[PDB]
Write a protein that holds these residues in place. Sequence first.
Motif, short mmCIF file in Angstrom:
data_model
loop_
_atom_site.label_atom_id
_atom_site.label_comp_id
_atom_site.label_asym_id
_atom_site.label_seq_id
_atom_site.Cartn_x
_atom_site.Cartn_y
_atom_site.Cartn_z
N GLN A 130 2.11 -4.32 -33.15
CA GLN A 130 2.86 -3.94 -34.35
C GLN A 130 3.37 -2.51 -34.17
O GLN A 130 4.42 -2.15 -34.69
CB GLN A 130 1.96 -4.00 -35.58
N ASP A 131 2.59 -1.70 -33.46
CA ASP A 131 2.96 -0.32 -33.19
C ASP A 131 3.83 -0.33 -31.94
O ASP A 131 3.44 -0.88 -30.92
CB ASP A 131 1.69 0.52 -32.95
N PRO A 132 5.01 0.33 -32.00
CA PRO A 132 5.95 0.41 -30.88
C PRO A 132 5.37 1.04 -29.62
O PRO A 132 5.59 0.56 -28.52
CB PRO A 132 7.08 1.28 -31.43
N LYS A 133 4.65 2.14 -29.79
CA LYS A 133 4.06 2.84 -28.66
C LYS A 133 3.00 1.99 -27.97
O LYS A 133 2.96 1.91 -26.74
CB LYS A 133 3.49 4.18 -29.10
N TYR A 134 2.16 1.36 -28.78
CA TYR A 134 1.11 0.49 -28.27
C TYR A 134 1.74 -0.71 -27.58
O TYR A 134 1.34 -1.08 -26.47
CB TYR A 134 0.20 0.02 -29.41
N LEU A 135 2.77 -1.27 -28.21
CA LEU A 135 3.47 -2.43 -27.68
C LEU A 135 3.97 -2.24 -26.25
O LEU A 135 3.86 -3.15 -25.44
CB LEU A 135 4.63 -2.83 -28.60
N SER A 136 4.54 -1.07 -25.94
CA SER A 136 5.02 -0.82 -24.59
C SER A 136 3.91 -0.91 -23.55
O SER A 136 4.12 -1.42 -22.44
CB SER A 136 5.64 0.57 -24.49
N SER B 30 -5.78 -11.33 -19.73
CA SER B 30 -5.32 -12.39 -20.64
C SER B 30 -5.15 -11.95 -22.10
O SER B 30 -4.33 -12.51 -22.81
CB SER B 30 -6.26 -13.59 -20.59
N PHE B 31 -5.93 -10.95 -22.52
CA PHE B 31 -5.87 -10.42 -23.89
C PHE B 31 -4.44 -9.95 -24.23
O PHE B 31 -3.93 -10.25 -25.31
CB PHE B 31 -6.89 -9.27 -24.01
N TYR B 32 -3.81 -9.28 -23.28
CA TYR B 32 -2.46 -8.77 -23.46
C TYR B 32 -1.45 -9.91 -23.43
O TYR B 32 -0.50 -9.93 -24.23
CB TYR B 32 -2.12 -7.74 -22.38
N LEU B 33 -1.67 -10.87 -22.54
CA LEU B 33 -0.78 -12.02 -22.42
C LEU B 33 -0.82 -12.88 -23.69
O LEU B 33 0.22 -13.29 -24.19
CB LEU B 33 -1.15 -12.84 -21.20
N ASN B 34 -2.01 -13.13 -24.21
CA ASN B 34 -2.18 -13.94 -25.43
C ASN B 34 -1.53 -13.24 -26.61
O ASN B 34 -0.82 -13.86 -27.39
CB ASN B 34 -3.66 -14.21 -25.71
N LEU B 35 -1.78 -11.94 -26.72
CA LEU B 35 -1.24 -11.12 -27.79
C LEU B 35 0.29 -11.23 -27.82
O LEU B 35 0.89 -11.38 -28.89
CB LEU B 35 -1.68 -9.67 -27.55
N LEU B 36 0.91 -11.25 -26.65
CA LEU B 36 2.36 -11.33 -26.54
C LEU B 36 2.96 -12.73 -26.56
O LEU B 36 4.05 -12.94 -27.11
CB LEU B 36 2.86 -10.65 -25.26
N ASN B 37 2.25 -13.70 -25.99
CA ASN B 37 2.78 -15.05 -25.87
C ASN B 37 2.36 -16.12 -26.87
O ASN B 37 3.06 -17.12 -27.03
CB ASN B 37 2.56 -15.56 -24.45
N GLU B 38 1.22 -15.94 -27.52
CA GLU B 38 0.74 -16.92 -28.48
C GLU B 38 1.46 -16.83 -29.82
O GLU B 38 2.12 -15.82 -30.12
CB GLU B 38 -0.77 -16.77 -28.68
N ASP B 39 1.36 -17.89 -30.60
CA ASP B 39 1.97 -17.93 -31.92
C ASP B 39 0.84 -17.72 -32.91
O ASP B 39 0.03 -18.61 -33.16
CB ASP B 39 2.67 -19.26 -32.17
N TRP B 40 0.73 -16.50 -33.41
CA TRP B 40 -0.32 -16.11 -34.34
C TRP B 40 0.04 -16.32 -35.80
O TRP B 40 1.18 -16.07 -36.22
CB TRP B 40 -0.69 -14.65 -34.11
N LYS B 41 -0.95 -16.76 -36.57
CA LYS B 41 -0.81 -16.99 -38.00
C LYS B 41 -1.88 -16.16 -38.68
O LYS B 41 -3.04 -16.22 -38.28
CB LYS B 41 -1.05 -18.46 -38.33
N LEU B 42 -1.50 -15.36 -39.66
CA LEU B 42 -2.46 -14.55 -40.38
C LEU B 42 -3.20 -15.47 -41.33
O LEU B 42 -2.63 -15.98 -42.30
CB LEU B 42 -1.74 -13.44 -41.15
N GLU B 43 -4.48 -15.71 -41.04
CA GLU B 43 -5.30 -16.60 -41.85
C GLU B 43 -6.58 -15.92 -42.31
O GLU B 43 -6.86 -14.77 -41.96
CB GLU B 43 -5.64 -17.87 -41.05
N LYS B 44 -7.33 -16.63 -43.16
CA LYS B 44 -8.60 -16.13 -43.64
C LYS B 44 -9.68 -17.01 -43.05
O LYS B 44 -9.52 -18.23 -42.98
CB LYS B 44 -8.67 -16.15 -45.16
N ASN B 45 -10.74 -16.39 -42.55
CA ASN B 45 -11.86 -17.11 -41.96
C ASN B 45 -12.87 -17.46 -43.06
O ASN B 45 -12.69 -17.09 -44.22
CB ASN B 45 -12.51 -16.28 -40.84
N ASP B 46 -13.96 -18.12 -42.68
CA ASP B 46 -14.98 -18.52 -43.65
C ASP B 46 -15.73 -17.35 -44.28
O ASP B 46 -16.51 -17.55 -45.22
CB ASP B 46 -15.96 -19.51 -43.02
N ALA B 47 -15.51 -16.14 -43.77
CA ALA B 47 -16.15 -14.96 -44.33
C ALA B 47 -15.17 -14.25 -45.27
O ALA B 47 -15.43 -13.14 -45.73
CB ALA B 47 -16.61 -14.01 -43.21
N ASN B 48 -14.05 -14.91 -45.55
CA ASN B 48 -13.01 -14.39 -46.44
C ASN B 48 -12.31 -13.16 -45.88
O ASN B 48 -11.82 -12.31 -46.62
CB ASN B 48 -13.59 -14.11 -47.84
#
Length: 294
Positions: free
Chosen positions: A240-246, A201-219
């Motif tokens: 983000q890396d092409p090789k990793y992405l494949s 699921s880690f790979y599926l989420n990484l590819l299919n979810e809509d991620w937003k770069l945010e800051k957590n409560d630890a800044n």
Amino acid sequence: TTPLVHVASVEKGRSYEDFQKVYNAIALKLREDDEYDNYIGYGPVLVRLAWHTSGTWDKHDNTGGSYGGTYRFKKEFNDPSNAGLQNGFKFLEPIHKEFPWISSGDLFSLGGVTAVQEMQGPKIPWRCGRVDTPEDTTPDNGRLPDADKDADYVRTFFQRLNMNDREVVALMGAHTLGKTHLKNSGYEGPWDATNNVFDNSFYLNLLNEDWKLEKNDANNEQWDSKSGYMMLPTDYSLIQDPKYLSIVKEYANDQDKFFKDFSKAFEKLLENGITFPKDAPSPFIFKTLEEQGL
Ligand code: HEM
Ligand SMILES: [K+]
């Protein structure tokens, strides 16, 4: 300092059955203490203890690694990068008390193997033979990876543990377990919906979810999705890396391949720095409680 050679030495008179008993004890306790971490259980923290106790290895001079079981010494036990692992160690205490003959290194690594298998992950062949080393052999803090970095950092970091691109992407897949805890690492949230089930699921989420770069409560910055998942900058770097992405796409589309590759890479990680004599027993493949009808 001439690079030390760590030759695997089987615990006196021990064989497969002895280790299967230790595995079963760990597996039975995992089932028993299911309340831990909001019902996630100890599975995830055990896989980490295994990875962190092995991840200090340096291919250059063979320092660190799983062999010595040095996490039992305060310098390593107190590594900021190990914050939260005390829970896994406390879990293993009763196990080690019942089986005082097993080395710390073998216990830490076996805990990881057991957790993965019990959480329905692939079978991970495991070899015994790690021998406890003195406190002065404990590696210094700072050999474990930072999470606020990019693909270049990840790639370079893992070269020290002799891991290539495929091994790196496969290993990171372990993030299919547990979650980040703000108090421990400064990050918060789970990577997926099955945090005690080993799946791709880690790979599926990484590819299919809509991620937003945010800051957590630890800044600290982290990628969040509406579904309640998160990804560390280091996890996000895999897409983000092409090789990793494949490779991410490959594992997202082939559960079996991910299992097979992870099994190989995880075993390798757990055996880095260890010299197994030619007469050493073959790797053990333990049956799950379920397979034993236990
Ligand atoms: C560049 C590499 C990696 C980084 C930066 C990283 C970072 C992190 C961070 C920040 C946490 C949260 C700790 C906490 O707050 O409790 C975590 C948890 C965890 N990581 Fe990693 N990780 C890396 C590689 C891996 C690998 C190779 C494995 C194992 C094969 C792994 C397995 C785990 C597991 C199972 C957890 C969950 C622990 C729990 O729920 O208590 N990680 N990781
Ligand atoms: K999962």
